[PDB]
Every structure is written in C-alpha cells, then in structure tokens.
C-alpha cells in the first residue's frame, strides 16, 4: 500500500501546486486590473471641471449677442430645400440674391 500512498500524495501535491499557480495568476490579474483601471481616472476627472467651466462661460456669453439680418436668407434656404430633394438647382431665371 506504500506505492498507492506515495502516488496519492504526489497527486495531491500536484493538485495543490496547480491551485497555487491559479491563485497567483488571479492575484496578478487583479493587480493588473487595479493598475490599469485608475490610471486615466485622474485626467478625466480634472478635465470634467474645465469642460463644465467652459460650457458655463459659453452659456453666459451667449446672452450678450446681437444679430443683424440680411437679404439672402430666403433665397439660400429655398435653394437648399430644392437641392435636398430631386437635387437639381431651381429653374431659371436666377433668384433674388445668388452667392
């Protein structure tokens, strides 16, 4: 029965060694996940505040804006709409303002 006991002990040692290798690999994977996960967090967290601030200042400066009309919006919109479907330019003669 000595041979059977030796074989069983060797098999048990091999199984526990395999379990040790599996645990070490899992630990290495966890360490790698820890290292990779939080590396970009600081940069994006820092940029969040800057992007919020620039959006806020753009909103604030939107109010102090004045627009002057011109005699080309209607013809341009009509030309774009006529090009959107059956994309041939509108028939002649030319419209009011062409540019």
């Amino acid at each position: 029965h000595s041979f059977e006991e030796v074989v069983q002990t060797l098999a048990s040692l091999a199984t526990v060694v395999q379990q040790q290798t599996i645990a070490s690999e899992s630990l290495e994977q966890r360490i790698t996940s820890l290292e990779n996960g939080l590396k970009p967090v600081y940069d994006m967290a820092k940029t969040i505040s800057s992007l919020n601030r620039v959006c806020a200042e753009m909103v604030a400066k939107y109010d102090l804006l004045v627009m002057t009309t011109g005699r080309a919006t209607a013809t341009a919109a009509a030309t774009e709409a006529y090009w959107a479907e059956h994309g041939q330019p509108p028939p002649g003669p030319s419209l009011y303002e062409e540019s």
Binding site: Y62, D63, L65, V66, M67, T68, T69, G70, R71, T73, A74, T75, A77, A78, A81, Y82, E85, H86, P90, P91, G92, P93, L95, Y96
Partner: protein, 1369 residues
C-alpha cells in the same frame, strides 16, 4: 350692372384722358406716360359730341381737382331746378310721412296691449314727430341726390348709345353726365381764395401768374370726375339725414337727457369739417382721422382722475397740433383762414358730454367722404418699412420658441388624455422625464429653469392633413393674379404703348376651379411639398387697393390660382389643428365677474384652490395694434416656428411657401390705367423698378398666414407673463389686441392707492412686453400704447367700469332704399332694412327713432322700385302692368303688414323688441297680423288673408325649410341661382372630381333620399334637416350655392354660354310674377281653407292647421310633430305689482290647482353708475344673469377614444349617434345606419357603435329645441338691467313635458322691465315686483314619442369611392 353703393376705391387716373379729348387740362395722374399716350377707341369721339361741345363752349381750358369741390357741392346743391326724371322723388313724400305716422300708431298700441306702454303720457306726440320729420335740414337734398343717382345709373347702364348723355341745371350748378363721367360747371366766386389771389385748389397744378390769363373774362369753371363721387355724395347725404333725424327724434322721448349727442353740435361739426376739406384738399383727412381717438380720450376722462389718465388726451392734442402745423406751412393761408381752420379739433376738445353721447358720436367718422388713392404713394408707404434691416436678440427668440412648444404640449396634455409619448432621449431632458414618469404636467410657477429642455422634446405627427369639411372655401367668386408669362396683359393696351404678346384666358376663381382636371387635397399637398411654387410661371403676386378708408393707401395681395389653393389649405389646416392652443377670443370683464372664481384664476403662485381667501382682485388693461406686425416679420425670427408647424403635421415644405416665393416676385399694383413707370416692349421680361415697383420684399403681407402670427403674438405674451409674475389675459379682434393684467391685493388697502398700484403694474407689464417685442424685431409705439383701469374698448363692445355703452349709429345710419340685392329685389331690400333695425335696437335704449327711420325708408324703397327699376325699360310701371289699375296707398299699407312667413312683406315685427330668436315664426306672425287688424276697425279680413293657395313644392325645400309654409310668395331667389349653377356645372365640369359627385342620377337620388327621410310616423322636419347635411346630397347643395351678386349672373361667360334663353328675360318674368303675387289680394286665395279655419280662436291650432294643409302631398295622412310652438307674448300676462299690493290673480283662492307664475324682483345694490343713477340703464348690480335650471341630464361615454380623426369620421359618428338615439322602439336601427354609413368610412357597422356615445335623453323634442341649441337666443337689450333683477321660476310648481322655452322667459321678463322704465328716474319707480301669470289657452303637455321606420333606402351609395368630403380609406 352698375351698383347703387360704393364698392370700389376712388381713383381718377383715367380722367386725365377724358380732359385730353375735350382740349382741357388736368393733372390727376403722377405717371408722365398718360400725358402723351394714345387715346382709346372710346373717350376719343367726344370731339364729335354736340352736347359736350356746347357744354364746354364758355369755360376756360384750365380745370380744377374734384378734391376741393366736393364740400362746395354738398352745400350749394339743393332741389329747385329742372330734372329730366319725370316722376320726381319728392312727389311721393306725403304718403311716406303718412306711413311713418302710422307707426307712432300700432307699435305704441302693441306696447300698450303687451303691458309695457309708458307711465308719462303726453297728448303732443303726433305733431312733434310730424314737425321733426318735416323740419329737417337734409330733407330735399336727399331726394335731389337720389334723383341724380337714378339718372347716373341709367346713363351708366348703356354707356354705348346716344342715351348715355344727361343734363341737369340747378340754380348755380350745371351737371353733364356721359358714360361713367361727370362734368361739373360751378361759379368761381364760391371758391376760397389764396393770399396770392388764386383759388386754393388751383395752386397744385398752376403757378400764380399762369392761373390768371387762363381765366381772364370768365365766371364759371369745369371739373371732371368719374361716376363714383356722385354715389359717395349721395351716401354722405343719406347718412347725415339719418343721423340728424334720429338725434332730433330722440329728444321727444327724453327731454331731460338723451343718449344721442345733439342735432345742432353735429351740424357745426359737419360745417367745420367741410370748410377744412375745402381749404386743405384731400390732404385734410389726416385731421378728420382724429375724431375717433379724441372721442376715446374724452370717454377715458369721464371717471375718477389719475395723474396718467390725462396722458391720452394730451398726446392726441399734441399729435393733431403737429399734423395741422406741418401740412399748412407750404400752403399760403390768409391770417383769417388760419383761425377758422382750427375749429374741428378745437370743438372736439371743448366738448362736455356724457360717456354715452361720446360713444354715439364715435360712429360719425365716414360722413365726410373718402380720399383719392394713388398707386404710387400706396406702394411707397409699404416699401419703406418692408425692406428695412433689423437687429435681433437670439435669447428672446429661443425663449419664445420654448414657450411656443410648451403651450402646444400643455394644450395636447389638457385634452384627450395626457402627454404624447415623447420619442427622445431621456438624458437630454433632466427634469422633465420625471414628470412624464409620474404623468403630471409641470405647474406654471416653477417653469423657469426647465424651459430650455422643451427644445429637446420630440413626438409623432399629432395633427392630420385632413378634417376639411367645406368645399365653399375653394370656390368663393374672388379674383386671382395672372401667371408670370402674361403679367402685363391686365393693363389697358393704349396707355402701355404696345400690344402684349401673351393674353390670359380667365381671371376668376369659380371658372378656374371647375377646370382643374387634377383636384383633391393630396394633389395640393404634393404640389406644395415639391416646391412647385418656385416655378418660373408662378411668381406674380399682384396688388389691389383697399376699400373705403381714410388712410393714405392700403393694399391686399393676389396670387396665382395654385398658390391661392395652397394658402387656403394652410389656413384651413391651422384654423382647427393649431391656433387652438392659443385662444384668441377671451372677452372677460373683471367688474361683472364672481369674486371666488376670479381670485382662484388670478393666483399666480400656485394654490388655485388652496390659497387664503379675502383677497380682492383689481384688473387693468392696455391696447396694442396687431396689423403693423405684418410687415415687421423676418425669416430669421419665424423660421423655427414654421419648421415646428411642418413637423407637427406630415408635411415637409408646406408652411414656408410664403417666405420662399415672396422675395422672388416683382411687386406692382394691378390697376388698369397706369402701368409701372418706364415700361416698354423691350424691357418686358426684365422690367425696371420705379416709384411704383420694387423687388426685394422681405416682410409679410396682411391676411396671409394670420393664424401663425397671432399664435406667435400669444406666445410672446405668455413669455412676458412667465418673466414677471402677473396674471395676463389676451384678446384679439380685427386689428386690435387687448391685454388685461390682474393684480390681486391682500385687502386693507381701501380704493385710492389700489387703482394706482394696478395701473403701475399694467404699465410695467407694458414696458416689459415692449422690450420683448422690440428684441423680436417689432417696435411698439410708447406714445400710442395707453393704459386703462376700467375702460375697455374692443371690437364690437366697449365697457366703462362694468357699464356697457350704447353704439347704435353704426347700423341705424346705413339704412337706404337702394341696396345691391340681386336684380334690385324688393324682398332683399326690405329684409336688409329689417335686420338693420333689429341690430340697431339690440343696442342703445331708445325704440322710436330707429323704427321711424326704417318706416320712412321702407315706403320710399317701395315707390322707387315701382317707378324707377333698372332691370326694365325706361318709363315702365310695375304697379300698372300687374294690377291693371293705378296702385294706391291702401294696397301698400295692407301688403306691408302681412309677415313674410305667410307671404307678405312685413319684416319689422314688434316682438323683436324683446328677443331676437323666435320660438315659432308662424304663431308670432299670426298674432301680429291679428293685433294689427284689431287696431283698425277692419277685423273682418283675417280669414281671407292667410289661407292663400299652396304652391307646387317638391320634397326638397321642406327639408331645407323645416318651419315654413308652402306658399309661392314667401320664397326667395335662391332656387333660381342654384338651378343656374347646376346647369353651368353640367355644361362644363372637367374637374374630374366634381363630375363624379355630380353624376346623371344625382337629382333623382336626392329626391329619393329626401322622400325617405320624411316617410316616418310621425314626421319630424327638424330631424330630417339636421341629418341631411352629412350626406353627399348636403355636399352637393353646399357646393351649388356660391352666387351672391347680380354681376356674376350677367358678366360671366361660362354661365351665359348655355344659349337657350337669356337669363335677363327669365329674371324679368320671375320679377313680374313675384310683383303680381303681392299687392294683388283676393286672387290667390281658396275657400276650403277659409271655411276650415273658422272659429278656431287659438294661434297654436291655426298654425298647426296651416302646416297640415300645406305639404299635403308630402304628408298624406302621417301627422307632423315638433314644429309648432306657442307665442310667448300671447302666453303670459303681467300684473305690475307695487310694494304694498297683492296680485288679484293670485288672490282668487287658487282653488282648483293653483296659479302658476314667474316672479321678477328688483335689487337695490348699485356697485357702479356712470354718470349717475338716474336711469337703470346707467347702473349695474350684483350680477349672475342666471345660471340654469339644472340644464339637462347628459349620459354616454365612448368605449374607445379615437386618435386624430378624419373629416368624414366625425360626421359618420354623429350620423350613427343621431340614428341610434332618434329611434329606440325597434331593433331595425342597425338596418338603417348601414346605407348611410357605407358612403363615408371604410369601417363597418358594429365597429363604430362603440365609438359613438350611448346618448339617451327624454321627449327628444326638447333636446332639439334648446339642448342642441339650433340658435342660442340671447336678447335685444343691453346687458345692464339684467344684472339688477332676480327672476324666480320655481313658483310655477308643476311647470304648467312643458311647452315653454325657459330660456326665452328670462329675456321676455328682463326686456319688459327695461322697456317699461327707460325714461324715468330710478327713485321715482313706484313698482316693486312683477308677476307673469300664464294663461291656460296656449300651453299643452307634449308626450314622449319616438320615430318609427317601415322601409329602408335600398340605394347603392357604394359608388362614392373617391376623395374629398366623401368616403376615405
């Protein structure tokens, strides 16, 4: 066929040619081409006219403008000379006065019989009225001007013969009329003189030295005008006579004080205005235009004074002073003339009148005439501020768009469920997604930070390109614009200088709609969606000058036919789909409104039903002008709104047609006798622009896209309400918008600073709104926008601190013997006069002046039509060719007393003094005729006066006229026009869609369906009429009727191509037959009915027997129900109790069952009174004007709520509901709905039965009586006394169901109480309460009966598988 009233703008451009053919000089036109253009074929032969040559053989070559001479003719012309008219209009004057005096009769007798009368009785009443009528300033001038109008109409009718020339010589003046033109010869001494020695009228065209050698040894001068100044002068004289007579008569009723201004102040105003016009020319209307704002300012000062209440008058005074100063510096007035010219506004300022008198004086504005319009200044006015560069603020536009979307979403949420299943990301709306999750709409107070999130909401196409149910909008007898290919063909080809290469074939709408081979709504959607309005041949947009107005110049646009169809389609879609989220008509008067509801609605900071009570609300208001917005709209502001409107429907490029094609057009005014400047054949395709043309129109046009602009204005007002925490109400009517601000106060603030705080809140709201609107590109006028506290004027009604002000000269002064009523039909004229009298008596508080005027005009119209008819030859007599003997006064007097329902010509029913909607037009007419015959000792004519002979009427007019009689004298000219239109359609119906609707067997099918609809037991005509309109027969009938004037009948080439016989001969024959029908008597009556109507002594029984004998062929033996109703005048009797008195009727022990009655009591609370409390019409009370006796029980809820339905779906649902409800005693109903339903929808029976509500009511007759409200009754009295009365009807007990219209009882009681005490002191009234006791002679118990049907239609309506208002897939 010339018309008797003004219907065109006054333009005198063509007269420049006429004076050229007679060797004269006159510079009317500003176009130099007319100076050196070839004369037409006509108005050139005047060299060979002997009469014209003899007329102008002693006058200078130089002439004068007609602008400065109209006031001279209005005074220097009177009837004293010789006139070619043989029967003079003044010859039959005594009979007119006799007929008028016969109405201080029975009218008064009717009032006394009813029980109204008047406490103060004066013997001197006939002679005072006679002297007032006889002693009028404008009496004979009116007759003379009517003679002139008759002569000029007769001359204008021919305009191609030798009979077109007429001559009149009256003392100082000579008039020569020739074919649309009039020459006036007047003395020179009557003209005012400029300080340089020349007339004021001659300094516009001639120099001082030039107009001294042309006159030399001459004493008379000649002016030339068209045959339209004469009609204007005739209308002016008639209006002045009417108002003077009304004002004079009003003094007889109430000597102490009347509601009309005066008859002497108005004369001074007329003289001052005439002098100002004669001095300043047509440029002087800028001062006449100030009569309305000055009157409004004076009315504003008739209440408690406030520091800013007098700003209106001050600003108006400054404006009128500046205008008078500016237009007089160039003119060289004498120092004496410069003092007299300042008498119009000087008199207007120093007026001391009650608010009622000023409100009445407000109406006299167009009594001086209208200016002369030019095609140059009219377009210069609109060009100057329609191509103006603007500056805009994007933030305001964004907020307005967000509020627009919020309003649409709120309206969708409020009705038919909740929300609309937003198909958008929930992360882009952080704060609105929670509300959708909880399915609750956010409250108004906290919508300030989530406004931008509304930009991100998305939804399916809520609305549908459907739900049009009227083809009359696509054929309306209007005019369109010619195509771009032939745009200069509308100008006369002699002033142009060349023959246009291209000539159009048609210009009208009705003869173009019938030729539209490919119609249908989807065709228009396809045409608009493909940008087909940008094609080279669809860009004209002509202009047209506006009608009678005092402005320098106003115009409306005209587009080619397909673009007009697109515009009409867009308006129809926006009318009911959109524009319902923004209610425009919101007339509210905070004074006569309940405190609790007002406080609940006025709580801005939420807690509508939870806020603390005891908080009075005081409202202020201000008025803005919405018309001026039209030209201030730019694409950069309206683009998002138009795109959202496109997205809410299934369309793509439909709602932005205007902004895409308007700038690409060539703007011009399409007037016949002046083309645009410098127009030759070479520059035809690319014409140059000048003083009357331009290219880049960037703004808007009035009338086009009005609903969208109103919605945008409402959105702006809502934005203003959101910005500042106030409660705002908006109302829009015409060119006016009223904004009301509600303040809410915590009490303990008396009434001194409360109104000041309310006015300050209104002022700050106005300032904020002005800022927002200016940021949007539209500028309000701070010097023209005014803040009021209790005085609100709007559209048709004006109130002063809750007291209504009379406005009756608007309609009463428009009465005239002559009106355009299709071939000068007498019935149309009499009906117009009657309805004008009814509308006038609806306002004010006097009764006799308006009826006296109507009585005066009725006989005059009868005589004019009898002797001078334009449709017949000269010298004809309609009263001799029919009777065979001369027609006397008695015949007219007897014929004018029979009501039109029974076949007479009486339209002035005294019962209209109490209420305007009669329960039965037959019983009331019988009562009126019986009373009139009872006044005179000639009562033995009632029987041989109403029997008459029934006519040959088919079963198509009984449905059209449910409550009517089958007599040939009570019919109008509608059937004639309908038959003519049907024949015209049959001859030419290449529309390819009308032809399917109007097939060969249309008439016979209509006859069968109408015969089946009246084949029940018992027969009810009202139900048949109500149900007939949803069938294709109703669509055909509504398409058939589009003729409205007697100019399309004769001048239309499509109608007159039928050959056969001319329409004029048929018109003459029918006119002669109709005239023979009246005034004949004892010739169209039978004897069987007369003997069958003996000893009835009951009006209801008489009416029922008359209805049964008539329509005998339609109703063989089946009884008729639900048409006969009693006359309430004959139903109740008054006792007029006094404080310490008992009713004798109620004191007779009430033995058998009791004495039912209605009680009326007078309150004592006054609330407000302006100016005093002497008259009840000047005061108000607690309020209420009743609520309702539980109305009725409503049952029925649809099993499934449909989505956005189609046009035919609702009609089918109502068909199913009515057919199910009317018949319930049999199971055959399912067999009756199917034939009707199969022609409207693709759905089958038993699939719509769950869609229709389970309606279930009682009697069914009462439901069709008032519950369905075929015509809501209202009343003909001002809503002032009704607020100071308590009406109790519960004392009736068992309610005499009942045969009583309970809505009309309140109106009858209130009107009787008002009429009884209208000229007496309030404290001098000796009567406390009134009892209205019913008589057991005209009250019956109506049983509950249902409708039964034996047969079924058995018609094949499946053939209607086409588009439009018929079956859809």
């Amino acid at each position: 066929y010339p018309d008797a009233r003004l219907s065109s703008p006054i333009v005198l451009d063509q007269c420049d040619l006429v004076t050229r053919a007679c060797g004269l000089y006159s510079s009317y036109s500003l176009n130099p081409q007319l100076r050196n253009c070839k004369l037409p074929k006509h108005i050139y032969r005047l060299k060979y006219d002997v009469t014209v040559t003899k007329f102008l053989s002693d006058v200078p070559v130089a002439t004068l403008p007609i602008d400065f001479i109209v006031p001279i003719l209005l005074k220097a012309l009177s009837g004293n000379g010789f006139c070619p008219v043989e029967p003079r209009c003044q010859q039959f004057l005594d009979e007119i006065i006799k007929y008028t005096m016969q109405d201080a009769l029975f009218l008064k007798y009717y009032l006394k019989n009813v029980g109204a009368q008047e406490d103060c009785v004066d013997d001197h009443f006939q002679e005072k009225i006679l002297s007032s009528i006889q002693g009028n300033e404008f009496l004979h001038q009116m007759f003379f001007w009517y003679d002139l109008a008759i002569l000029t109409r007769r001359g204008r009718l021919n305009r191609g013969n030798s009979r077109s020339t007429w001559f009149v010589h009256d003392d100082l003046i000579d008039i020569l009329g020739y074919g649309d033109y009039v020459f006036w010869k007047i003395p020179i001494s009557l003209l005012p003189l400029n300080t340089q020695g020349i007339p004021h009228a001659a300094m516009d065209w001639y120099q001082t030295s030039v107009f001294k050698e042309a006159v030399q040894g001459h004493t008379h001068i000649v002016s030339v005008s068209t045959a339209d100044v004469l009609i204007m002068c005739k209308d002016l004289i008639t209006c002045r006579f009417n108002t003077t007579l009304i004002s004079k008569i009003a003094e007889v009723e109430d000597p102490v004080c009347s509601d009309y201004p005066n008859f002497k102040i108005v004369s001074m105003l007329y003289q001052s205005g005439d002098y100002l016009l004669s001095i300043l020319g047509s440029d002087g209307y800028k001062i006449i235009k100030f009569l309305e704002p000055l009157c409004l300012a004076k009315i504003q000062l008739c209440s408690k004074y406030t520091e800013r209440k007098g700003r209106f008058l001050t600003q108006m005074h400054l404006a009128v002073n500046h205008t008078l100063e500016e237009i007089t510096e160039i003119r060289a007035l004498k120092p004496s003339q410069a003092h007299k010219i300042r008498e119009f506004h000087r008199t207007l300022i120093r007026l001391e009148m009650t608010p009622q008198q000023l409100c009445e004086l407000f109406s006299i504005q167009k009594h001086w005439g209208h200016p002369v319009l030019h095609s140059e200044t009219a377009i210069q006015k609109v060009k100057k501020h329609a191509t103006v560069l603007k500056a805009l603020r994007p933030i305001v536009i964004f907020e307005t768009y967000c509020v627009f979307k919020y309003s649409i979403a709120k309206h969708y949420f409020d009705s038919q469920g909740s929300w609309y299943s937003v198909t958008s990301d929930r992360n882009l709306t952080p704060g609105l997604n929670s509300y959708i999750k909880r399915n609750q709409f956010p409250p108004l107070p906290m919508i300030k930070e989530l406004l931008w999130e509304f930009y991100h909401l998305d939804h399916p196409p809520l609305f549908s390109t459907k739900i049009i149910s009227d083809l009359s909008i696509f054929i309306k007898d209007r005019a369109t614009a010619v195509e771009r290919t032939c745009w200069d063909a509308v100008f006369e080809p002699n002033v142009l200088g060349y023959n246009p290469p291209h000539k159009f074939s048609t210009k009208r709408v009705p003869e173009q709609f019938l030729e539209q081979e490919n119609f249908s709504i989807e065709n228009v959607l396809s045409y608009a969606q493909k940008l087909e309005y940008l094609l080279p041949q669809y860009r004209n947009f002509s202009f047209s000058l506006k009608e009678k107005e005092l402005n320098v110049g106003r115009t409306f646009g005209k587009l080619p036919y397909p673009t007009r169809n697109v515009q009409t389609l867009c308006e129809a879609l926006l009318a009911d789909g959109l524009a319902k989220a923004f209610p425009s008509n919101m007339m509210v008067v905070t004074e006569r409104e309940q405190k609790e509801s007002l406080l609940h609605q006025a709580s801005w900071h939420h807690t509508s039903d939870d806020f603390g009570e005891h908080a009075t609300v005081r409202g202020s208001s201000f008025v803005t002008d919405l018309e001026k917005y039209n030209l201030a709209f730019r694409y950069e502001f309206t683009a998002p709104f138009i795109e959202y409107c496109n997205r809410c429907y299934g369309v793509k490029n439909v709602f932005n047609w205007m902004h895409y094609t308007i700038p690409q057009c060539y703007m011009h005014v399409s007037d016949y006798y002046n083309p645009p400047h410098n127009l030759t054949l070479e520059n035809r395709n690319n014409p140059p622009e000048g003083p009357s043309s331009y290219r880049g129109h960037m703004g808007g046009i009035e009338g086009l896209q009005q609903k969208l602009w109103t919605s945008i204005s409402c959105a702006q007002i809502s934005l203003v309400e959101i910005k500042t925490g106030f409660k705002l109400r908006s109302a829009v009517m015409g060119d006016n918008q009223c904004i009301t601000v509600l303040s809410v106060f915590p009490l303990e603030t008396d009434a001194d600073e409360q109104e000041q705080s309310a006015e300050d809140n209104a002022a700050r709201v106005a300032a904020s709104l002005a800022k927002v609107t200016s940021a949007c590109g539209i500028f309000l006028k701070p010097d023209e926008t005014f803040v009021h506290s209790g005085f609100i004027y709007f559209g048709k009604k004006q109130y002063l601190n809750g007291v209504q002000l009379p406005q009756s000269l608007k309609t009463a002064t428009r009465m005239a013997p002559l009106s355009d009523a299709i071939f000068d039909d007498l019935q149309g004229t009499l009906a117009s006069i009657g309805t004008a009298f009814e509308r006038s008596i609806s306002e004010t508080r006097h009764i006799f002046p308006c009826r006296i005027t109507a009585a005066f005009h009725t006989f005059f119209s009868v005589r004019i039509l009898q002797y001078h008819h334009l449709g017949f030859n000269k010298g004809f007599d309609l009263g001799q060719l029919t009777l065979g003997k001369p027609l006397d006064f008695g015949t007219i007097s007897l014929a004018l007393a029979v009501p039109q329902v029974l076949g007479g010509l009486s339209f002035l029913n005294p019962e209209k003094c109490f209420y305007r909607n009669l329960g039965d037009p037959v019983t009331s007419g019988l009562f009126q005729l019986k009373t009139y015959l009872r006044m005179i000792e000639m009562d033995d004519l009632f029987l041989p006066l109403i029997a008459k002979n029934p006519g040959n009427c088919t079963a198509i007019d009984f449905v059209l006229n449910p409550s009517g009689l089958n007599v040939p004298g009570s019919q109008d000219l509608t059937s004639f026009l309908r038959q003519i239109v049907r024949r015209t359609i049959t001859l030419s119906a290449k529309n390819k869609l009308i032809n399917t609707l109007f097939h060969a067997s249309a008439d016979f099918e209509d006859e069968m369906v109408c015969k089946w609809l009246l084949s029940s037991t018992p027969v009810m005509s009202r139900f048949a009429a109500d149900i007939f309109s949803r069938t294709p027969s109703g669509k055909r009938l509504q398409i058939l009727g589009y003729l409205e004037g007697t100019r399309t009948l004769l001048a239309s080439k499509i109608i007159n191509n039928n050959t056969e016989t001319p329409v004029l001969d048929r018109l003459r024959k029918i006119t002669l037959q109709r005239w023979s029908l009246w005034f004949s008597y004892l010739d169209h009556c039978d004897n069987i009915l007369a003997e069958a109507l003996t000893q009835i002594t009951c009006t209801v029984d008489l009416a029922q027997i008359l209805r049964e004998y008539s329509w005998a062929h339609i109703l063989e033996g089946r009884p008729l129900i639900g048409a006969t109703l009693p006359c309430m005048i004959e139903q109740f009797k008054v006792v007029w109790l006094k404080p310490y008195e008992q009713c004798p009727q109620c004191s007779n022990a009430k033995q058998p069952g009791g004495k039912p009655f209605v009680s009326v009591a007078v309150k004592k609370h006054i609330v407000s009174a302006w100016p005093n409390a002497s008259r009840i019409s000047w005061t108000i009370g607690d309020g209420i004007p009743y609520i309702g006796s539980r109305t009725e029980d409503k049952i029925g809820q649809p099993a499934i709520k449909p989505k956005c339905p189609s046009a035919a779906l609702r009609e089918a649902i109502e068909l199913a509901s009515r057919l199910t409800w009317v018949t319930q005693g049999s199971s055959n109903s399912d067999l009756l709905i199917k034939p009707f339903l199969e022609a409207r929808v693709n759905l089958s029976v038993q699939e719509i039965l769950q869609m229709t509500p389970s309606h279930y009511s009682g009697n069914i007759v009462h439901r069709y009586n008032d519950q369905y409200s075929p015509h809501s009754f209202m009343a003909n009295r001002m809503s002032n006394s009704a607020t100071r009365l308590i009406v109790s009807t519960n004392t009736l007990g068992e309610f005499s169901d009942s045969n009583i219209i309970f809505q009309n009882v309140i109106n009858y009681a209130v009107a009787l109480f008002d009429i009884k005490f209208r000229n007496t002191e309030a404290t001098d009234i000796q009567y406390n309460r009134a009892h209205l006791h019913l008589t057991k002679c005209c009250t019956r118990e109506v049983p509950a009966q249902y409708l039964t049907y034996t047969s079924t239609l058995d018609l094949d309506l499946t053939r209607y598988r086409e588009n439009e208002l018929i079956y859809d897939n």
